[PDB]
Amino acid sequence: SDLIPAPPLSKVPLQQNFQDNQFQGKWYVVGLAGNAILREDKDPQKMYATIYELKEDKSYNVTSVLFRKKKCDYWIRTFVPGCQPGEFTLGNIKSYPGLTSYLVRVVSTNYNQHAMVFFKKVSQNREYFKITLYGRTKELTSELKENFIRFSKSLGLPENHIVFPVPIDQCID
């Protein structure tokens, strides 16, 4: 199992002045890229969504929804504020078999339109990294999508490892 090496953090920007309250709400995953992300053609990835909710202890209750096989699959997650506003670790790791690492980095966002988030984790000892292009709506500008493509590449990902989930109306509305 061969993988493209996770980029060195110094290459992953952090959203200047992150506002955890404004980043709340529903986000559409309009762009996906990772060393474990492949541009399938016989069955293109469907768009799923992720809802971020602040807890009073300032942690996020991240829950996602995807339409898998005639149903909505929901998966919960708790992000815990890291060392700098915008960074996050995984709450209750250890309740996730094979997980020794997990990190989130809000690269950039305008809180109303879009956002770019970098994730990196170590499962089974294999290092995985990915980047989601978030959209407040199910679609966005070409400017934003090529910016996403540009960044993914700066991290070592070939076009091939960059995909745009096709918009759907099931479960993510």
Ligand X SMILES: *[C@@H]1O[C@H](CO)[C@@H](O[C@@H]2O[C@H](CO)[C@@H](O)[C@H](O)[C@H]2NC(C)=O)[C@H](O)[C@H]1NC(C)=O
Q: Which residues participate in the annotated binding site for a carboxymycobactin?
A: 48-50, 121, 130, 134
Q: How far is the CB of 55 from ligand X (least distance, A)?
A: 5
Residue nearest to ligand X (CB): 61
List strand residue ranges (DSSP E) for 53-113, in order. Answer: 60-67, 72-81, 87-90, 99-109
Q: How far is the CB of 22 from ligand X (least distance, A)?
A: 15
Distance CA 68, CA 79 (A): 24
> CA dihedral in degrees (53, 60, 119, 88; nearest 10)?
150
Name residues contacting ligand X, limited to 20-59 (CB under 6 A): 53, 55
Percentage helix, strand, coil for the chain under 3-state DSSP, each rounded to 5? 10, 40, 45
- Of 59 and 170, the one with the shorter C-beta distance to ligand X is 59
- Total binding residues for ligand X by CB under 6 A? 3
Nearer to ligand X, 61 or 108 (CB): 61
User: How many distinct helices (H) and strands (E) make up the chain?
Assistant: 1, 9
Task: Tell me how far apart the alpha carbons of residues 126 and 93 are, in angstroms, rounded to a whole number.
Answer: 16
The residue with tokens 């953090």 is 9
Residues of this chain, 60-79, that bind ligand X according to CB under 6 A: 61
In the bound state with ligand X, the residue whose beta carbon lies nearer, of 11 and 26, is: 26
Which amino acids are annotated as binding site for enterobactin, given as ranges?
A: 102, 130
In the complex, minimum distance from the CB of residue 29 to ligand X, in angstroms, rounded to a whole number: 20
Q: Which is nearer to ligand X, 96 or 113 (CB)?
A: 96
Minimum Å gap between C-beta 112 and ligand X is 21
Q: How far apart are the first and last CA of the chain?
A: 36
* Positions in the binding site for ligand X (CB under 6 A): 53, 55, 61
